[PDB]
Design a protein around this motif. Structure first.
Motif, PDB file in Angstrom:
ATOM      1  N   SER A 165       0.898  -1.354   0.103  1.00 35.01           N
ATOM      2  CA  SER A 165       0.009  -0.126  -0.081  1.00 35.01           C
ATOM      3  C   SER A 165       0.733   1.033  -0.033  1.00 35.01           C
ATOM      4  O   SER A 165       2.226   1.166   0.330  1.00 35.01           O
ATOM      5  N   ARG A 299     -11.007  -7.705  -5.405  1.00 37.51           N
ATOM      6  CA  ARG A 299      -9.628  -8.356  -5.365  1.00 37.51           C
ATOM      7  C   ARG A 299      -9.729 -10.099  -5.675  1.00 37.51           C
ATOM      8  O   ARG A 299     -10.293 -10.760  -4.684  1.00 37.51           O
ATOM      9  N   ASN A 302      -7.176 -12.500  -2.841  1.00 39.76           N
ATOM     10  CA  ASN A 302      -7.159 -12.110  -1.437  1.00 39.76           C
ATOM     11  C   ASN A 302      -7.830 -13.482  -0.887  1.00 39.76           C
ATOM     12  O   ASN A 302      -8.836 -13.330  -0.316  1.00 39.76           O
ATOM     13  N   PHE A 314      -4.054  -4.652   2.868  1.00 37.02           N
ATOM     14  CA  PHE A 314      -5.437  -4.364   2.097  1.00 37.02           C
ATOM     15  C   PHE A 314      -6.239  -3.664   3.088  1.00 37.02           C
ATOM     16  O   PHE A 314      -7.647  -3.536   2.811  1.00 37.02           O
TER      17      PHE A 314
END
Ligand code: NAP
Ligand code: ZST
Ligand code: NA
Length: 318
Positions: A165, A299, A302, A314
């Motif tokens: 991220s 996603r 995931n 996430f």
């Protein structure tokens, strides 16, 4: 003969904007896949320790160089450090096995596969009495420091990250004694997960983005029937039909026109070729705006229950 356009990295090295994904490419089939790709003009191969087929990828690359279909300097090979090897002596070892399997003397890019570190040991996904991931001691910051040495020694041309991220990239960039910057962030990207803010952030820092699962990863094990499907999306096919292209080709071209590197996987020769024939058409702005509007923040990649560990990526908005 085809040639993917180059995307320039902060190191001035040139990364081909289309590459070959190799995750889930079975032993037996992957070697021929790499060979077909190379003959078609692919130069960028996306690999990983954890895909457990690097040696066959190695075989194919070696055989192509030897038969002079391609030179090493023009190939762009990417591999990744798996979270169970973040501790310094393990970083060097995992890299050495990857490099050996690939029959190379250097990698073009070496990526941190996932930001969250896992418990070391003879086990790829260590878990507790439930199926909860077990975290390790060393962090991606620790790992990076070891990886920087690979660059110092000429064993790797550049480093990058995957599944980070912007908060995690911020952490790496502000790290004290930072020697090398990430040249790319490889994350899931497609019209159901357009990553607008993360792409904006990365580009604003001189970090490219590599889009994985661009076709929606239909061959992922955990796929469920209700899960959305990009390749079967009628609006996608509608736009494809207009350009006399396939849905796949539109899904690949989408990234090219955002200046985002994209790495579709196939072991089917016809598809491998089809996937790189995407430099003979353009999507209109209206088409791009339409495709961007499909974002669902969904996603495909995931599946691992890991949100309890410190460096789960996430939870952040981006
Ligand atoms: N965390 C990470 O860094 C991460 C995670 C996921 C993926 N990746 C990388 O990105 C690559 C791509 O992602 P992915 O493998 O999940 O999925 P993907 O490229 O979105 O989709 C692969 C699937 O699409 C099929 N396909 C390929 N070309 C096609 C075409 N032209 N028409 C129709 N179907 C087509 C393939 O079939 P066949 O093989 O049967 O032809 C395969 O089943 C991976 O292989 C891996 O290298 C990285
Ligand atoms: O790895 C690939 O390329 C594809 C990939 N993805 N996933 C989903 C994952 N979700 C994760 C989440 C974390 C986390 F950082 F969030 F903890 C760490 C590691 C993972 S693997 C898998 O479970 C997997 C299994 C075998 C081979 C490849 C993969
Ligand atoms: Na896509």
């Amino acid at each position: 003969s085809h040639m993917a356009t180059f995307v320039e990295l902060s190191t001035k090295a040139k990364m081909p904007i289309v590459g070959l994904g190799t995750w889930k490419s079975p032993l037996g089939k992957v070697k021929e896949a790499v060979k077909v790709a190379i003959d078609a003009g692919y130069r960028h191969i996306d690999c990983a320790y954890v895909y457990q087929n690097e040696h066959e990828v190695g075989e194919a690359i070696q055989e192509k160089i030897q038969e002079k279909a391609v030179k090493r300097e023009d190939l762009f090979i990417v591999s990744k450090l798996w979270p169970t090897f973040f501790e310094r002596p393990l970083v060097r070892k995992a890299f050495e096995k990857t490099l050996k399997d690939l029959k190379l003397s250097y990698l073009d890019v070496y990526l941190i596969h996932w930001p969250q570190g896992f418990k070391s040991g003879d086990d790829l996904f260590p878990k507790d009495d439930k199926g909860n991931a077990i975290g390790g001691k060393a962090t991606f910051l620790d790992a990076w420091e070891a990886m920087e040495e690979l660059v110092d020694e000429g064993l790797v041309k550049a480093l990058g990250v995957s599944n980070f991220s912007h908060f995690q990239i911020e952490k790496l960039l502000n790290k004290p004694g930072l020697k090398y910057k990430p040249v790319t962030n490889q994350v899931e990207c497609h019209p159901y997960l357009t990553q607008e803010k993360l792409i904006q952030y990365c580009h604003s820092k001189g970090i490219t983005v590599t889009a994985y699962s661009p076709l929606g990863s239909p061959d992922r094990p955990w796929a469920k029937p209700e899960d959305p499907s990009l390749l079967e999306d009628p609006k996608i096919k509608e736009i494809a039909a207009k350009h006399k292209k396939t849905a796949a080709q539109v899904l690949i071209r989408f990234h090219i026109q955002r200046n985002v590197i994209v790495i579709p996987k196939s072991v089917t020769p016809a598809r491998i070729v089809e996937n790189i024939q995407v430099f003979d058409f353009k999507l209109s702005d209206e088409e791009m705006a339409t495709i961007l509007s499909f974002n669902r923040n969904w996603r495909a990649c995931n599946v691992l229950q890991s949100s309890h560990l410190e460096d789960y990526p996430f939870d952040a908005e981006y």
